[PDB]
Design a protein around this ligand. Structure first.
Ligand code: CA
Length: 223
């Protein structure tokens, strides 16, 4: 997260960190046994870490649970990042409490101008690299489809949406991928991609969760 702020310990209870000996992606807890993340974050041997703030020190409230299976969307395309969504089933159900809670799926898509909360442990600098210890937060609005398409003609506004600041300086970044974009208490996006980070006229692109709700439910129900 570039240009964001420190969220505060466990203020984003549904935020998950995907770990493979180190933090590599974010995710969202949607129920006691399922996490939603980005398909390009797929990897074997994933350990899901819930209730995290400082990812480098055990502070209490953390729950480490291995992934029993990762379900990448069948139509995911690694070149275009279209359908960049993945479901992760936990080996055991997480213990839900005040510091570890799930986030609700949307019943309708969000409109341009809607303010959202994006969070993660990704790179905090536009130029160079700098990974934080604690969770970072960023409030950002969803942009209009016209602006999103004029920013890059490689997006499919049906499965993607732009959010952020065209003036640059505030954006999600490397390491935030798979993370949540929550607006009005509903998970509307998944950190997917972007051209650089916090660059002028280059807003972040996110997976449009509202158009995957049916798939999510059907997939979870059969697994
Ligand atoms: Ca920790």
């Amino acid at each position: 997260i570039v240009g964001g702020y420190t969220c505060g310990a466990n203020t984003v209870p549904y935020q998950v960190s995907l770990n493979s000996g180190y933090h590599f992606c974010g995710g969202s807890l949607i129920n006691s046994q399922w996490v939603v993340s980005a398909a390009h974050c797929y990897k074997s041997g994933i350990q899901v870490r819930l209730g995290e703030d400082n990812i480098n020190v055990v502070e209490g409230n953390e729950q480490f649970i291995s992934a029993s299976k990762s379900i990448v969307h069948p139509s995911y395309n690694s070149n275009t990042l279209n359908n960049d969504i993945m479901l992760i089933k936990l080996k055991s159900a997480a213990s839900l409490n005040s510091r570890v809670a799930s986030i609700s799926l949307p019943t309708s898509c969000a409109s341009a101008g809607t303010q959202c909360l994006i969070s993660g442990w990704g790179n905090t600098k536009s130029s160079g690299t700098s990974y934080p210890d604690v969770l970072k937060c960023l409030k950002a609005p969803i942009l209009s489809d016209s602006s999103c398409k004029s920013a890059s003609s490689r997006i499919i506004t049906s499965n993607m949406f732009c959010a952020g600041y065209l003036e640059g300086g505030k954006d999600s970044c490397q390491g935030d991928s798979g993370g949540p974009v929550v607006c009005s208490g509903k998970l509307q996006g998944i950190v997917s991609w972007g051209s650089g980070c916090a660059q002028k006229n280059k807003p972040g692109v996110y997976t449009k969760v509202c158009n995957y709700v049916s798939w999510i439910k059907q997939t979870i129900a059969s697994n």
